[PDB]
Amino acid sequence: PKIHYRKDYKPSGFIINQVTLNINIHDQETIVRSVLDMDISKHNVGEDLVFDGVGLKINEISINNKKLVEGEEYTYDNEFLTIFSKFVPKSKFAFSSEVIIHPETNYALTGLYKSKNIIVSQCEATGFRRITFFIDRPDMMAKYDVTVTADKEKYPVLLSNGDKVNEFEIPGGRHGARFNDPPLKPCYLFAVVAGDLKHLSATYITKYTKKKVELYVFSEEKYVSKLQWALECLKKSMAFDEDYFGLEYDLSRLNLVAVSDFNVGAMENKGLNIFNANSLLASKKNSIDFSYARILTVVGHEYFHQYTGNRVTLRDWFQLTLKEGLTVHRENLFSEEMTKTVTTRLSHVDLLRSVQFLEDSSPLSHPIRPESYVSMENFYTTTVYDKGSEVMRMYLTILGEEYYKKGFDIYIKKNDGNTATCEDFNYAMEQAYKMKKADNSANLNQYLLWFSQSGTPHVSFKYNYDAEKKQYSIHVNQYTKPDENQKEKKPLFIPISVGLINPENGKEMISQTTLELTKESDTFVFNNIAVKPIPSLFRGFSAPVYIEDQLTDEERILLLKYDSDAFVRYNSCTNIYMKQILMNYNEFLKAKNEKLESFQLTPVNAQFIDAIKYLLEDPHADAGFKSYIVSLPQDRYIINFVSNLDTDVLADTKEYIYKQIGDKLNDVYYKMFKSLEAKADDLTYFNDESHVDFDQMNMRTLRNTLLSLLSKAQYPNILNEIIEHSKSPYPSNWLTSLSVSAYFDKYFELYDKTYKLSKDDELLLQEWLKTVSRSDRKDIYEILKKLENEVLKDSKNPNDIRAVYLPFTNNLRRFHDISGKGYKLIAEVITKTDKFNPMVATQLCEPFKLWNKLDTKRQELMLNEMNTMLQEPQISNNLKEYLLRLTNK
Ligand SMILES: O=C(CNc1cc(F)cc(F)c1)N[C@@H](C(=O)NO)c1ccc(-c2cc(F)c(F)c(F)c2)cc1
Ligand SMILES: [Mg+2]
Ligand SMILES: [Mg+2]
Ligand SMILES: [Mg+2]
Ligand SMILES: [Mg+2]
Ligand SMILES: [Zn+2]
């Protein structure tokens, strides 16, 4: 397998100036004719002309309208088309080809493929070569002139990039459309869509040039009523880029298209963004609440690529985080402003510190700009995206809004229309940094280590207060564990947003302050500090690090109650929980290991429980925040702090802690569940798809979290509430009634009720599948067998497969059954899926990522299944490369 190295980047010996495509869709095949107007670059040294071309059936290839002859003038091996240099012209020439491809049987969903009755392309990263021959790398920019033809009845709507410049009828019930896109673009942003699409549309007038932009959102006819929120989100995205960044859309039209079969969430093809239907379509009657934030973030994300990815492009794939991390950061700024809820930022931190921290301490650990890759499909990772976003956000923390905006505009103005690298962005931020510090000697050279150094830094603290001197000191240390990428880890530039809370009145003691830690350790001293403060550290989660605050639980409770920063309050709660979890875990472990007939458990801190009650009973406190404080930290967060983690002992630990708190607060929980109903389930705007209230959605989250806690606790007659909840019009509510009914004899009655509510909407049925998959059922293995036989069957839809299996893999007690039956089951699903969709098979490997963190018996069970998958003769390149790296082989 070819390893590509970042240091090996070299420009092509060739240039592709113009692409002229004819894509003729027929019943059993698609014919692709392509003329490439090419040239010889200054880097050419007489080499063979090598095109990428994967799975193409050649009808003919030509140079300057002279048919080429196979074996003597070119070789094709189903991966590379090699034209021997003797037959390669030395000046401007035309290469042309006609190939046959087969979208109908393209179940890997890369290149050109059929999703239900829609023909659709997915070309990022290296999928364009599955459509026609190309030098398939993002530094080959070309103009595109694309004609698509098809049966008019099956495919009345034809779309590609650029302006539709012709529409014409063809004998035999066919028709064509020609799309010309003069501005240069890389081939991974090419797209084509053909189908019986229905749409909503609007006109957006840009803020400064007053250009009219036509906005279209498309789906299959059955789901056209689910398009309205997406259109509203697109308008919102457009306005936010104008308002925050001063950036306007440059083209006359923007199309968004939903398809049912998609490997990921969505794709930013220029003027033609293509979406997983679950990330574009929603209605209040047929979607859970999560869909609304999902559509907002995904529509926003693809729109923000128009600058950060499409107008400023990548030189090579090693710069992926420069468009993905930066666009996630732009998307997070947008979402935070649109939702105006503190849980938006908390939810991104929660994902980073569980999923991405796990990845960064796994054998898969890599920096946000890796040094090498084998599979580009495996290159797309939470490290590149989400740690990338936190690295791009730290620039804003360091610079402040005004100078961040100045540096960002320097980046856009200097690189608009050109490729760029991570260094280019750092240079633009450095210029703003010089301006801010009024110091042209200031620099961000150290900041570049965030792109090259893998692993999560640990930041720890000690404090000193001299009452007589009124002098306060914060001593800070940073440390990154050595790994396979660096034997010696260098200190990073770590910005530490800090407040100092007066413990007597809860007030701020200093102005906003960002400590710039640039050494392995430093001491930050504050004078005129009138009383000993409680420090509020890493406000907003200001760096992607393990925070060791070294505070007592009494101090953390005070921050939880009285601090001004939502993250520090939530993190103080998290830290209290974590101390309790580790202590009880060790006590349960010892009792198991020593076969104790009796033992003691350390109870949950009573003042902590009192503080939870105090916040829950505060009517001015935020419902979303409340839902976070009654939930223990995620299992994948906990696992970063325990070696040889016994999942059974952890399940017993969580059970004890939840029972402790519930035994004190269940009556509070129940009272709030009842009092929240009126506002949480208000139907005033149920038939207004444009009216989305994130606060109300957070109140439903709180109710459904409380209902879960009360159901698990078998709170007296709570089943009455569950049954009434099942009649709510909101799917978040009636799907909640299914999963919380798992603890009752009514489960299968609600199983059937919610199935009939769900089965006639493709996306709702998938949410139903997830709810069943996630259900806390002792018979979950028989239930999964039932889903397989009755609902899932042989579906190759990734949404179907992921819905049935991934939630179950988070069932701590049952997926990790000591027999290994859960590992066996998911390995069978991975191997089966790998026959037709390697990239989704690799997604289904996610539960194995922590394999070497578990107890030794479960490590061996997991390792056995991965070795079994690795031994399959037909294993894909994706799956082999991933499991080889994951198993340290
Ligand atoms: O949708 C999402 C959710 N984020 C995400 C985060 C991860 F860490 C991993 C992941 F998979 C997704 N991201 C978008 C995005 O960034 N849109 O702008 C995206 C992601 C991957 C491809 C792609 C790459 C290939 F090599 C392919 F072969 C292929 F079919 C698709 C296309 C678009
Ligand atoms: Mg083929
Ligand atoms: Mg405006
Ligand atoms: Mg289907
Ligand atoms: Mg290794
Ligand atoms: Zn993206």
PDB file of N, CA, C and O in Angstrom, residues 598-619:
ATOM      1  N   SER A 598     -18.444  -8.331  52.424  1.00  0.00           N
ATOM      2  CA  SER A 598     -19.029  -7.049  52.778  1.00  0.00           C
ATOM      3  C   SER A 598     -17.964  -5.982  52.595  1.00  0.00           C
ATOM      4  O   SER A 598     -16.767  -6.261  52.680  1.00  0.00           O
ATOM      5  N   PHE A 599     -18.411  -4.759  52.340  1.00  0.00           N
ATOM      6  CA  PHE A 599     -17.482  -3.661  52.115  1.00  0.00           C
ATOM      7  C   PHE A 599     -18.271  -2.364  52.209  1.00  0.00           C
ATOM      8  O   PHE A 599     -19.503  -2.374  52.263  1.00  0.00           O
ATOM      9  N   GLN A 600     -17.548  -1.247  52.217  1.00  0.00           N
ATOM     10  CA  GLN A 600     -18.160   0.068  52.287  1.00  0.00           C
ATOM     11  C   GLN A 600     -17.923   0.844  50.997  1.00  0.00           C
ATOM     12  O   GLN A 600     -16.883   0.699  50.340  1.00  0.00           O
ATOM     13  N   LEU A 601     -18.919   1.647  50.630  1.00  0.00           N
ATOM     14  CA  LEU A 601     -18.823   2.601  49.536  1.00  0.00           C
ATOM     15  C   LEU A 601     -18.838   4.015  50.093  1.00  0.00           C
ATOM     16  O   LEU A 601     -19.617   4.320  51.000  1.00  0.00           O
ATOM     17  N   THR A 602     -17.995   4.871  49.546  1.00  0.00           N
ATOM     18  CA  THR A 602     -18.015   6.286  49.929  1.00  0.00           C
ATOM     19  C   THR A 602     -19.267   6.940  49.357  1.00  0.00           C
ATOM     20  O   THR A 602     -19.446   6.936  48.133  1.00  0.00           O
ATOM     21  N   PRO A 603     -20.136   7.513  50.181  1.00  0.00           N
ATOM     22  CA  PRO A 603     -21.356   8.142  49.661  1.00  0.00           C
ATOM     23  C   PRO A 603     -21.047   9.394  48.858  1.00  0.00           C
ATOM     24  O   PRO A 603     -19.991  10.014  49.004  1.00  0.00           O
ATOM     25  N   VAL A 604     -22.022   9.788  48.029  1.00  0.00           N
ATOM     26  CA  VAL A 604     -21.926  11.045  47.296  1.00  0.00           C
ATOM     27  C   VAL A 604     -21.932  12.202  48.286  1.00  0.00           C
ATOM     28  O   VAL A 604     -22.638  12.170  49.308  1.00  0.00           O
ATOM     29  N   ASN A 605     -21.109  13.215  48.008  1.00  0.00           N
ATOM     30  CA  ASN A 605     -21.025  14.404  48.851  1.00  0.00           C
ATOM     31  C   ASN A 605     -22.408  15.033  49.016  1.00  0.00           C
ATOM     32  O   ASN A 605     -23.079  15.344  48.030  1.00  0.00           O
ATOM     33  N   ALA A 606     -22.844  15.204  50.270  1.00  0.00           N
ATOM     34  CA  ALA A 606     -24.191  15.712  50.511  1.00  0.00           C
ATOM     35  C   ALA A 606     -24.324  17.179  50.116  1.00  0.00           C
ATOM     36  O   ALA A 606     -25.398  17.610  49.678  1.00  0.00           O
ATOM     37  N   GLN A 607     -23.270  17.979  50.313  1.00  0.00           N
ATOM     38  CA  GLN A 607     -23.354  19.375  49.887  1.00  0.00           C
ATOM     39  C   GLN A 607     -23.401  19.491  48.369  1.00  0.00           C
ATOM     40  O   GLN A 607     -24.007  20.426  47.833  1.00  0.00           O
ATOM     41  N   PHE A 608     -22.797  18.543  47.659  1.00  0.00           N
ATOM     42  CA  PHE A 608     -22.942  18.497  46.206  1.00  0.00           C
ATOM     43  C   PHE A 608     -24.394  18.250  45.813  1.00  0.00           C
ATOM     44  O   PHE A 608     -24.947  18.938  44.943  1.00  0.00           O
ATOM     45  N   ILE A 609     -25.031  17.255  46.437  1.00  0.00           N
ATOM     46  CA  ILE A 609     -26.442  16.992  46.162  1.00  0.00           C
ATOM     47  C   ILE A 609     -27.291  18.218  46.494  1.00  0.00           C
ATOM     48  O   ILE A 609     -28.191  18.592  45.730  1.00  0.00           O
ATOM     49  N   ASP A 610     -26.993  18.887  47.613  1.00  0.00           N
ATOM     50  CA  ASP A 610     -27.702  20.125  47.947  1.00  0.00           C
ATOM     51  C   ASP A 610     -27.536  21.190  46.870  1.00  0.00           C
ATOM     52  O   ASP A 610     -28.469  21.962  46.596  1.00  0.00           O
ATOM     53  N   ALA A 611     -26.338  21.285  46.288  1.00  0.00           N
ATOM     54  CA  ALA A 611     -26.101  22.291  45.261  1.00  0.00           C
ATOM     55  C   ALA A 611     -26.870  21.956  43.993  1.00  0.00           C
ATOM     56  O   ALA A 611     -27.402  22.851  43.329  1.00  0.00           O
ATOM     57  N   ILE A 612     -26.944  20.671  43.635  1.00  0.00           N
ATOM     58  CA  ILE A 612     -27.777  20.283  42.499  1.00  0.00           C
ATOM     59  C   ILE A 612     -29.228  20.687  42.740  1.00  0.00           C
ATOM     60  O   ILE A 612     -29.884  21.258  41.861  1.00  0.00           O
ATOM     61  N   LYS A 613     -29.751  20.396  43.936  1.00  0.00           N
ATOM     62  CA  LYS A 613     -31.127  20.764  44.262  1.00  0.00           C
ATOM     63  C   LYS A 613     -31.332  22.268  44.144  1.00  0.00           C
ATOM     64  O   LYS A 613     -32.334  22.735  43.593  1.00  0.00           O
ATOM     65  N   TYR A 614     -30.393  23.035  44.686  1.00  0.00           N
ATOM     66  CA  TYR A 614     -30.492  24.488  44.665  1.00  0.00           C
ATOM     67  C   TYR A 614     -30.592  25.008  43.234  1.00  0.00           C
ATOM     68  O   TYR A 614     -31.422  25.877  42.936  1.00  0.00           O
ATOM     69  N   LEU A 615     -29.756  24.481  42.337  1.00  0.00           N
ATOM     70  CA  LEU A 615     -29.814  24.913  40.945  1.00  0.00           C
ATOM     71  C   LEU A 615     -31.089  24.426  40.266  1.00  0.00           C
ATOM     72  O   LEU A 615     -31.726  25.183  39.529  1.00  0.00           O
ATOM     73  N   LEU A 616     -31.481  23.165  40.497  1.00  0.00           N
ATOM     74  CA  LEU A 616     -32.712  22.667  39.888  1.00  0.00           C
ATOM     75  C   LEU A 616     -33.915  23.502  40.305  1.00  0.00           C
ATOM     76  O   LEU A 616     -34.823  23.748  39.501  1.00  0.00           O
ATOM     77  N   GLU A 617     -33.949  23.940  41.560  1.00  0.00           N
ATOM     78  CA  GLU A 617     -35.110  24.681  42.031  1.00  0.00           C
ATOM     79  C   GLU A 617     -35.055  26.164  41.686  1.00  0.00           C
ATOM     80  O   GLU A 617     -36.007  26.892  41.996  1.00  0.00           O
ATOM     81  N   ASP A 618     -33.995  26.623  41.041  1.00  0.00           N
ATOM     82  CA  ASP A 618     -33.908  28.035  40.693  1.00  0.00           C
ATOM     83  C   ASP A 618     -34.671  28.265  39.394  1.00  0.00           C
ATOM     84  O   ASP A 618     -34.269  27.759  38.338  1.00  0.00           O
ATOM     85  N   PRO A 619     -35.772  29.022  39.422  1.00  0.00           N
ATOM     86  CA  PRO A 619     -36.534  29.238  38.186  1.00  0.00           C
ATOM     87  C   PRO A 619     -35.825  30.132  37.197  1.00  0.00           C
ATOM     88  O   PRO A 619     -36.236  30.178  36.033  1.00  0.00           O
TER      89      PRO A 619
END
